[PDB]
A paper describes a structure:
For example, we have shown that the thermophilic ribosomal protein L30e from Thermococcus celer has a ΔCp value of ∼5 kJ mol−1 K−1, which is much smaller than the value of ∼10 kJ mol−1 K−1 obtained for the mesophilic L30e from yeast. To study the contribution of charge-charge interactions to the thermostability and the reduced ΔCp of thermophilic proteins, our group had systematically removed 26 surface charges on T. celer L30e by single charge-to-alanine substitutions. We used the double-mutant cycle to investigate the effect of pair-wise interaction of two salt bridges (E6/R92 and E62/K46) on protein thermostability and ΔCp. Since thermophilic proteins tend to have more salt-bridges than their mesophilic homologs, our observation that salt-bridge reduces ΔCp may provide a general mechanism for enhancing thermostability - thermophilic proteins have more stabilizing salt-bridges that reduce the ΔCp, leading to the up-shifting and broadening of the protein stability curve.
We have selected two salt-bridges (E6/R92 and K46/E62), which are located on opposite sides of T. celer L30e. The crystal structures of the E6A/R92A, K46A/E62A, and E90A/R92A variants were determined at resolution ranging from 1.8 to 2.0 Å. The root-mean-square deviations (r.m.s.d.) between Cα atoms of the wild-type L30e and its variants were <0.5 Å, suggesting there were no major structural change in these variants. The values of ΔΔGint were in the range of 1.9–3.6 kJ mol−1 for the pairs of charged residues (E6/R92 and E62/K46) involved in salt-bridges. Removal of a negative charge by E6A substitution from the wild-type L30e resulted in an increase of ΔCp for 0.8 kJ mol−1 K−1. These data suggest that the two substitutions are not independent, and the pair-wise interaction between E6A and R92A affects the ΔCp. For the double-mutant cycles involving the breakage of a salt-bridge, the values of ΔΔCp(int) were −0.8±0.4 and −0.9±0.5 kJ mol−1 K−1 for E6A/R92A and E62A/K46A, respectively.
Author numbering:
A (entry chain B), B (entry chain A): 0 to 96
The structure:
């Protein structure tokens, strides 16, 4: 990952992202996302859940170094965000390896 | 992941793959691979190790449903293979989501 916060902003403004543990799980499970992002302190059960389905389908998982509070802030949401999925990167390089 | 065994064969024959736990760890750690594959029964410490570094860099990890013995067989190696990395997919669709 390169310049995560910038890449995330670019995806959010120009692409399509979906926020929340359940929705991200639905994606890791069913497909339909290009990348799942988890907060470092996302509750263990949620992280393991996402990680299991992500390995099942080969969807990449990226751990945001910071907290669910910091991730919510980065996303401009009035609440914590523990996980999200990138459905379309838009003009972002967030998927670049 | 779609038609894993076929996709893997195509990457192996037309792209670049690297086999082994240490080499895959080096990739998950330093970048340079597009996908890490782990056998279902790869020893837990090795899986966790790869999985940690993969999350650090957002490199996708795919779990092969079968054993390290079966994975070695699939790769035509005379030994078990617990993990590998796809450096170049070649003509393969192994990276498609």
């Amino acid at each position: 990952m390169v310049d995560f916060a910038f890449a995330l902003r670019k995806a959010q403004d120009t692409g399509k992202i979906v926020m929340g543990a359940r929705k991200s799980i639905q994606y890791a499970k069913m497909g339909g996302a290009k990348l799942i992002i988890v907060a470092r302190n996302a509750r263990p059960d949620i992280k393991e859940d996402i990680e299991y389905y992500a390995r099942l389908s080969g969807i990449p998982v990226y751990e945001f170094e910071g907290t669910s509070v910091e991730l919510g802030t980065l996303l401009g949401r009035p609440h914590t965000v523990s996980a999200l999925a990138v459905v379309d990167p838009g003009e972002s390089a967030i998927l670049a390896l």
